[PDB]
A paper describes a structure:
241242, 258259, and 273264 form interactions with PvRBP2b169–470 at helices α5 and α6, and 241242 forms additional interactions with part of the N-terminal loop between residues S181–N185. These antibodies bind epitopes that partially overlap with the TfR1 binding site at helix α5 (green highlight). 258259 and 273264 are from the same clonal group and as expected the crystal structures show they adopt similar heavy and light-chain CDR loop conformations upon binding PvRBP2b. Superimposing the crystal structures of PvRBP2b-241242, PvRBP2b-253245, PvRBP2b-258259, and PvRBP2b-273264 onto the PvRBP2b-TfR1–Tf cryo-EM ternary complex reveals that these antibodies cause steric hindrance with TfR1–Tf. The ability of these antibodies to directly interfere with TfR1–Tf binding is consistent with these antibodies showing inhibition in all interaction assays. Crystal structures of PvRBP2b-241242, PvRBP2b-253245, PvRBP2b-258259, and PvRBP2b-273264 show that these antibodies bind to the PvRBP2b-TfR1 interaction interface, and therefore inhibit through steric hindrance with TfR1. 241242, 273264, 258259, and 253245 competed with each other and were inhibitory in the reticulocyte-binding, FRET, and IP assays. 3E9 shows steric hindrance with 241242, 253245, 258259, 273264, and 283284, while 6H1 shows steric hindrance with 251249.
The parasite adhesin P. vivax Reticulocyte Binding Protein 2b (PvRBP2b) binds to Transferrin Receptor 1 (TfR1) and Transferrin (Tf) on the surface of reticulocytes, which is critical for red cell invasion. PvRBP2b interacts with TfR1 through its C-terminal domain (residues 461–633) with a buried surface area of ~1271 Å2, and with Tf through its N-terminal domain (residues 168–460) with a buried surface area of ~386 Å211. Here, we isolate and characterize anti-PvRBP2b human monoclonal antibodies from two individuals in Cambodia with natural P. vivax infection. To further elucidate how human mAbs recognized PvRBP2b, we structurally characterized several antibody Fab fragments in complex with PvRBP2b169–470. We were able to determine eight crystal structures of PvRBP2b169–470 with antibody Fabs with resolutions ranging from 2.45 to 3.45 Å—PvRBP2b-241242 (3.15 Å), PvRBP2b-258259 (3.05 Å), PvRBP2b-273264 (2.55 Å), PvRBP2b-253245 (3.45 Å), PvRBP2b-237235 (2.45 Å), PvRBP2b-243244 (3.35 Å), PvRBP2b-251249 (2.90 Å) and PvRBP2b-283284 (3.15 Å).
Residue numbers in the entry:
A (entry chain A): 169 to 467
B (entry chain B): 6 to 141, 151 to 229
C (entry chain C): 7 to 215
Amino acid sequence: TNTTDNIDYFDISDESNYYLISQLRPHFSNIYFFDEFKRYASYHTEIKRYEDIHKTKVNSLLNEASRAIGICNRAKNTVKGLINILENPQKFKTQRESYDVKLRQYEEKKEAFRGCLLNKNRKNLDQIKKINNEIRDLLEKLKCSQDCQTNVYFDMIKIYLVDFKKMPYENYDTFIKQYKNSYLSGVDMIRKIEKQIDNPVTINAIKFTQKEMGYIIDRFEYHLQKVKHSIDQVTALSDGVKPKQVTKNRLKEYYFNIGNYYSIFKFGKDSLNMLNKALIHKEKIVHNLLGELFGHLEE
Amino acid sequence: EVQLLESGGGLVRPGGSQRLSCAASGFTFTPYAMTWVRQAPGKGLEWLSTISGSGGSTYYADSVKGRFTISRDNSKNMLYLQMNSLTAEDTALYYCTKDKDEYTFGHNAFDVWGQGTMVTVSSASTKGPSVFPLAPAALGCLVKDYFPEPVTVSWNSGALTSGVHTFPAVLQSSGLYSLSSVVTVPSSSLGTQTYICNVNHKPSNTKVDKKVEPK
Amino acid sequence: YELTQAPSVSVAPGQTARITCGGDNIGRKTVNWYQQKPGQAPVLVIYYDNDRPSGIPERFSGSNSGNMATLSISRVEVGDEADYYCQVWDSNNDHPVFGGGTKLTVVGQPKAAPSVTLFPPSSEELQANKATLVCLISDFYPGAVTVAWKADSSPVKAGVETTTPSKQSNNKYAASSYLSLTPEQWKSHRSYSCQVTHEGSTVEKTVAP
């Protein structure tokens, strides 16, 4: 109804750009690595004993991550209200403040919101490093010293390639290039026909909504490129050399290698899905605005 | 003030590699789409490569495709251009730009431009400039047979800079440059005053001072 | 997408200069203009056919319709002498494209004759068994001269290297020429002359060993 009911498409990363916080569970891509190590530990009797204490260590981080995101629901719904006013000309006319005033209110609340998602999760990011090191110590309890069989490592690679086939990368790449093409043409025609004689509310709402689209497109292509990397890297491992036995030190980083890739994949699959419907909902809002703009021709 | 700063441009043998950098400051670097554009000496501007904000979209020109790679670090506001297998037709001065808006992917104007770094590709090695004095009214020094540009010429360690006028260097058929720097000074100052032209060449790592006086 | 631009366009001061930029259907896409001073960086002058960045004088206007996009500079002063390009987004290739560039030259400035100084080969260079003659032309306008070296009274037609005219900060122009010759050629001849002809009137300097 020319309004946005879901603003899950915002995200924030730390100043080091190492951790990416998503509004969708599990919020962190590292949690997927923690859930995958439980599957890694399922094939090792020495590590499988500590799997019970691992869930309490991982679920607590997932609970505190889900708790910190919920604290920002006050900042979230505040921005959602300013978006619904700036993208809806009819709603913008029920209030009395100038359009430039509401844009300044939107920019202040938007960063206050994205700052909340990062600030309330700073304690969780430090816990990610600890659980990563705790996984390293659990993998040291393996019975192998210098001849660790890579069957478990390569059996997980075969599973990852099957999971990769479930995601439509070709359709996603076709979708993003096609919608990014329509988005660029929309911005460029507004440059051609813009004028400051009549009421610019319908034109201002288009550019405001288009600014949201360009952000969603940039975030969609980030995950689409990141997911492509994880698919191509794991596939390169299966098509590359297969050492029948490696040491334990290299086996720890072996699971860490495929674990990080599959984590980015499942994390990107969650984001690419949400970012796809947000771009679709944003296109319908713009076309309704375009329909409302070209609806009063005798004026 | 939004500013773009570039470096890394230098002399490289054909087939070699070179890494260009574009330092950004004064604006939110992440949302804007950065662009690379080179300009051959005398020729016009030529677009090369533009990259999206998050880095998920990268464009390249057909002349640089397969050899050049664009990249950015959104935590340091840096912008890179890895050049590989450079040919003689790649020798140009390279600019980096940003779209005037955000989330545009190069479909915008380019409001902020860097000063440009110079990439030179040739088989010749760096040569030290030979400095010879120009005896007299109008006196100067001759900076001859150096490669590549530039050569900064200072008079008396920057003491006198009035009446000085360094001409743009000539490019001889050998590929070595040559220029001359003269200084306008009255005849009464001649004889008693001393004039030492100080020549500095960055690639050759050699500085030379020469005395000019009537003899 | 091909952008055709005239290589050069001249104009007298106070008049209105018209830089053009052609396209098959250039009125369908926005056109941005740039200005690059000699040895300087490009500056966005006009964007989106007619929008003008803040700080750009009001004399800079733009038009775009059909097959022609034109940038207009009115009340032209000597400071407008620069190179102007147009930028368009390639539709089916998905990348920007720049035009060939139009060189705006302002005429009607007061004619000024070139001052030249000729230098003989230094004694330190003669010890290296090489000789170079330096002829330095400067402080002239318009920026176009013709240098001719003459051994005694006959042109040498060998070993002459001349630079392109460069615009100095004085809005004038400067150029230089070099003659490479053996010290035997320098000491055998009576003298060496540098003849630079500006607007049909020639200026010449003569030096001798």
